[PDB]
């Protein structure tokens, strides 16, 4: 249920389907992107590029 480590590469923006965040009980508590191929990408919630991607996805969903 938790991320073991954060993904270190570039966020593939065109491949993103959605996101969620994991529980606060997690050590590497994360924003998790889900790709259209169904892969998960474990990300630092405080990283600026992560935040920008979520803001884009939120605009699609709201």
């Amino acid at each position, epitope marked *: 249920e938790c991320c073991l480590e954060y993904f270190k590469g570039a966020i593939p*923006l*065109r491949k993103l389907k959605t996101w969620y965040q994991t529980s606060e009980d997690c050590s590497r508590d994360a924003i998790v992107f889900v790709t259209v191929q169904g892969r998960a990408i474990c990300s630092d919630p405080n990283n600026k590029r992560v935040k920008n991607a979520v803001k884009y996805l939120q605009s*699609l969903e709201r």
Partner: antibody, heavy 121, light 114 residues
Framework: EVQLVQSGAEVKKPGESLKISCKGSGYSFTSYWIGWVRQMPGKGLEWMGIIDPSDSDTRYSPSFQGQVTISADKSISTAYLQWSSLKASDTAMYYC??????????????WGQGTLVTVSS | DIVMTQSPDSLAVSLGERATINCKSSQSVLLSPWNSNQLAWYQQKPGQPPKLLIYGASTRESGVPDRFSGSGSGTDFTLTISSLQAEDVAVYYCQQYYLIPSTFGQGTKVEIKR
């Protein structure tokens, strides 16, 4: 320079199948997405779908999903648009075009010359 | 989806005069973290493929003459031709690429007034 070369005009009968092609040259083909755009006679541009030739990730407009198949063969730097069974209402110009590299998505920065498809009995 | 709408549908302008075409998106196309409006303008002459003129709402593509400019933000955009030349007779399309489907406006035909 960047070229997109589309196959020649097609005159077909209703119910026939058809695959048209869009060949890239002068750039890294797998580095950019390719789109297909329909223009029915005297009408406007309709975004049909796009494909990432690197992995064949394909996205369709809801209006065209299940109605045409878009594909690509990266070994020969070619994208395709295909119908299993043409209708007279498929009569249109079909353009392929390259999606630019900007985030998140981008405009169509280069266009093929178009393939005219005429469907009639 | 985002719906793109252009006004007027047809425009007649005297040679040498200013032409203005408007484009509205049904939702904002401002990609905020990138401060870019995800909006393009294309020109299509009879029997030719469309050609990209303007992207990011206001950036002229390489080799596009200075008389073409784009402005606006959010949901309202304008294509201006400062002085219509004879070779500018064409159909002009706007397009959003904020998301996919990256849909086009219906097009605006520009012709010479006489």
């Amino acid at each position: 320079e960047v070229q997109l070369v589309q196959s020649g005009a097609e005159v077909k009968k209703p119910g026939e199948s058809l695959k048209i092609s869009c060949k890239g040259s002068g750039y890294s083909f797998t580095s950019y997405w390719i789109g297909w755009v329909r223009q029915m006679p005297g009408k406007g541009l309709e975004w049909m779908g796009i494909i990432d030739p690197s992995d064949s990730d394909t996205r369709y407009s809801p209006s065209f999903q299940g109605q045409v198949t878009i594909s690509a063969d990266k070994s020969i730097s070619t994208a395709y648009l295909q119908w299993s069974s043409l209708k007279a209402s498929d009569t249109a110009m079909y353009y392929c075009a390259r999606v630019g590299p900007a985030d998140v998505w981008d405009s169509f920065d280069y266009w093929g010359q178009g393939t005219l498809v005429t469907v009639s009995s | 989806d985002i719906v793109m709408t252009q006004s007027p549908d047809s425009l007649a302008v005297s040679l040498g005069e200013r032409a203005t075409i408007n484009c509205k998106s049904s939702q904002s196309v401002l990609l905020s973290p990138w401060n870019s409006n995800q909006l393009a303008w294309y020109q299509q002459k009879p029997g030719q493929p469309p050609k990209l003129l303007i992207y990011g709402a206001s950036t002229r593509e390489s080799g596009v003459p200075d008389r073409f400019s784009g402005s606006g933000s959010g949901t309202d955009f304008t294509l201006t031709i400062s002085s219509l030349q004879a070779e500018d007779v064409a159909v002009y399309y706007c397009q959003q690429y904020y998301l996919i489907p990256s849909t086009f406006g219906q097009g605006t035909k520009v012709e010479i007034k006489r």
